[PDB]
Amino acid sequence: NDNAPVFDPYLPRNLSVVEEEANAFVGQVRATDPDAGINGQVHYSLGNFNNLFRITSNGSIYTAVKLNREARDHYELVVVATDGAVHPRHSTLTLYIKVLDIDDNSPVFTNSTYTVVVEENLPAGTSFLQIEAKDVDLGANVSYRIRSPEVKHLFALHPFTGELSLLRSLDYEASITFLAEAFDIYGTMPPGIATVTVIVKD
Ligand SMILES: [Ca+2]
Ligand SMILES: [Ca+2]
Ligand SMILES: [Ca+2]
Ligand SMILES: [Ca+2]
């Protein structure tokens, strides 16, 4: 047993794995040990994050659990190569793991139910309520729209700001309830939904 395991010098150190997948392949390392028999046989282990990653006998690394990018997106993973000698010799490598984002969150409204009380003579053009939804995924841009067709003659919803404005003065349709949506313009998850109730003071 003249020497330790040495990792291949040009193994990638920056590895990326998609969030929300257990048993996902992260990458593969290799350490060689130019020695005869059991002094030349390399075994792999991890020095940290053992509940989150595992390594196989050929140096392939997999997630043990679903990673959540929204909770943490980076791991400095220590890989250990040990030979089979009676006095074992070890070497280590740090890998820098990046967790990649998927669209797994719909926009979430600040309120499940917005309620607003307006004066009967509120002028046409008044913006009287702002709604707001947040999307925790990476690069998301939230846009707003009114789902319910039957109020589209009464109110307009600004697609960027979420400001709700009056199109015509109020008379007899003393409340009106409808659904608003918030969606990631380039996302794939469903829209977030919230109810809006407008109450007219007589
Ligand atoms: Ca050796
Ligand atoms: Ca997630
Ligand atoms: Ca995500
Ligand atoms: Ca999203």
UniProtKB/Swiss-Prot annotation:
Q: How does it assemble?
A: Antiparallel heterodimer with CDH23. Found in a complex with TMIE and LHFPL5. Interacts with LHFPL5/TMHS; this interaction is required for efficient localization to hair bundles. Interacts with MYO7A. Interacts with USH1G; this interaction may recruit USH1G to the plasma membrane. Interacts with TOMT. Isoforms CD1 and CD3 interact with TMC1 (via N-terminus) and TMC2 (via N-terminus). Interacts with PIEZO1.
Q: Which disease is it linked to?
A: Defects in Pcdh15 are the cause of the Ames waltzer (av) phenotype. It is characterized by deafness and a balance disorder, associated with the degeneration of inner ear neuroepithelia.
Section of the entire sequence shown? 716 to 923 of 1943
The protein's name is Protocadherin-15
**Annotated glycosylation sites:** 14, 58, 111, 141
Functional summary from the UniProt entry:
Calcium-dependent cell-adhesion protein. Required for inner ear neuroepithelial cell elaboration and cochlear function. Probably involved in the maintenance of normal retinal function.
Expressing tissues? Expressed in brain and sensory epithelium of the developing inner ear. Expressed in the retina, in the photoreceptor inner segments, the outer plexiform layer, the inner nuclei layer and the ganglion cell layer and, more diffusely in the inner plexiform layer (at protein level). Not detected in the retinal pigment epithelium (at protein level). Expressed in the spleen, dorsal root ganglion, dorsal aspect of neural tube, floor plate and ependymal cells adjacent to the neural canal.
Location in the cell: Cell membrane
Q: Which organism is it from?
A: Mus musculus (Mouse)
What does the comment on domains in this protein's record state?
Cadherin repeats 1 and 2 mediate calcium-dependent heterophilic interaction with CDH23.
Question: Start and end of every Cadherin domain?
Answer: 9-109, 110-202
